Amino acid sequence: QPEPDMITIFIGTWNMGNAPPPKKITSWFLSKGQGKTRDDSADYIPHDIYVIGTQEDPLSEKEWLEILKHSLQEITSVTFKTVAIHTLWNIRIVVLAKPEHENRISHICTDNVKTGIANTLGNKGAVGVSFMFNGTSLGFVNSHLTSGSEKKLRRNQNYMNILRFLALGDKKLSPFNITHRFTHLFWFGDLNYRVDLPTWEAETIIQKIKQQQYADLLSHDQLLTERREQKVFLHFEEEEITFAPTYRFERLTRDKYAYTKQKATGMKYNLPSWCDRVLWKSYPLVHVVCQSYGSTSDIMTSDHSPVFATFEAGVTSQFVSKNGPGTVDSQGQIEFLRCYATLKTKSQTKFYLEFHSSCLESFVKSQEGENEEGSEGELVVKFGETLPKLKPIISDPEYLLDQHILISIKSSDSDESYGEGCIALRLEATETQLPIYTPLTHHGELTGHFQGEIKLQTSQ
Ligand SMILES: *Sc1ccccc1Cl
């Protein structure tokens, strides 16, 4: 039975509004309703992995697991295995996988982050799961961010706290936050970004939704605008939104948006908004294709509609050679030429690099670079031809060209990372000097750039 080189992943996000679900929720897992929907001819084909994020979930873990497993069994005739479940308050993540994947999945991690301080600590934050699927690391974050049209900055702050403090993936990757630890990272939830139009325009917005004319609403969506100004979710992707706003509905119909201010809303308007979202970030030149992104039309217990997204995701096998793992393969090497970091820091300390990759026996520290002044005020850290030669554990090009090198630039004075990035070894050529480039971030904010040339030797 061959190891897969592609899997499909279902991501669901639903804010349940502290109400039990209806008896049938299969439309969610079938990607049926509004938006980019799944072909009917696929309905019996199980996804490899289902990741369900809920918010305002009133159920016990046991109650929800029974609903989910029985739903998937009805659709697919497959009894899914529970990989992980983690709940913080009423925020929950469930990972289910086909039974054939049980011995492909390992290194399962769960964590949560509580956002806010005093007043604002007590119901918002995130849960997450990570694991290895054969040679591929997968991370999943379900967040319920701060509500309210006038709190987009708080949401962005909640995002940065979650990506700093959520402890998933390989703890040996100590310089790297969750935005660098995974081949594929899926981040979803009730992100709570709103359509930022005047209150007086509520009936106009509803009119536009009834006509399926979303363009003038999406141009005011706070997540799209904040992402375009690099205030949040830098270097993440989102599929085009082609479904109606998923909030705020009157319960038991989808015929009505409930937007007017009420005691129950803290006298806040809730103009129709795309609160409920799925974003991803995959390492460079790895296959990831969104095959659905939409909302259900027939699940009406909540003031939110469920959102679904599905993905094709490239995966690799757990490679063994005569040599690595447990030694190097002298036939493999990674060299760096003409490399320099450009950093935004106003500080003057020496810097060195760390190279981290599961193709190395352990991480590699460089010598200190040479600091120069850039012509527009920047710090340029020159490594020239001084970076070490990296010794991969396996030289086979079928393995090595599928790997990635994480790079941290660290202060010699403090050993604190000033920037993190990632370089794909999926090169156009081996034994050939080729340009490389990554942006550098720290706490998910842009801090600089790393560029230079690479020369990769494989056993071919
Ligand atoms: S499994 C895991 C991942 C990251 C930090 C700590 C742990 Cl136990």
UniProtKB/Swiss-Prot annotation:
Superkingdom per UniProt: Eukaryota
Tissue specificity: Specifically expressed in immune and hematopoietic cells. Expressed in bone marrow and blood cells. Levels vary considerably within this compartment. Present in at least 74% of immature CD34+ cells, whereas within the more mature population of CD33+ cells, it is present in only 10% of cells. Present in the majority of T-cells, while it is present in a minority of B-cells (at protein level).
Please report the PTM annotation for this entry. Answer: Tyrosine phosphorylated by the members of the SRC family after exposure to a diverse array of extracellular stimuli such as cytokines, growth factors, antibodies, chemokines, integrin ligands and hypertonic and oxidative stress. Phosphorylated upon IgG receptor FCGR2B-binding.
The places in or outside the cell where this protein is found are:
Cytoplasm; Cell membrane; Membrane raft; Cytoplasm, Cytoskeleton
Q: What does this protein do?
A: Phosphatidylinositol (PtdIns) phosphatase that specifically hydrolyzes the 5-phosphate of phosphatidylinositol-3,4,5-trisphosphate (PtdIns(3,4,5)P3) to produce PtdIns(3,4)P2, thereby negatively regulating the PI3K (phosphoinositide 3-kinase) pathways. Able also to hydrolyzes the 5-phosphate of phosphatidylinositol-4,5-bisphosphate (PtdIns(4,5)P3) and inositol 1,3,4,5-tetrakisphosphate. Acts as a negative regulator of B-cell antigen receptor signaling.
Question: What does the record note on quaternary structure?
Answer: Interacts with tyrosine phosphorylated form of SHC1. Interacts with tyrosine phosphorylated form of DOK1. Interacts with tyrosine phosphorylated form of DOK3. Interacts with tyrosine phosphorylated form of SLAMF1/CD150. Interacts with PTPN11 in response to IL-3. Interacts with receptor EPOR. Interacts with receptors MS4A2/FCER1B and FCER1G. Interacts with receptors FCGR2B and FCGR3. Interacts with receptor FCGR2A, leading to regulate gene expression during the phagocytic process. Interacts with GRB2. Interacts with PLCG1. Interacts with tyrosine kinases SRC and TEC. Interacts with c-Met/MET.
- Family listed: Belongs to the inositol 1,4,5-trisphosphate 5-phosphatase family.
Write out the domain note: The SH2 domain interacts with tyrosine phosphorylated forms of proteins such as SHC1 or PTPN11/SHP-2. It competes with that of GRB2 for binding to phosphorylated SHC1 to inhibit the Ras pathway. It is also required for tyrosine phosphorylation.
What is the recorded name of this protein?
Phosphatidylinositol 3,4,5-trisphosphate 5-phosphatase 1
- Print the organism lineage: Eukaryota, Metazoa, Chordata, Craniata, Vertebrata
Instruction: Specify first residue, last residue and whole-protein length for the fragment.
Output: 398 to 857 of 1189
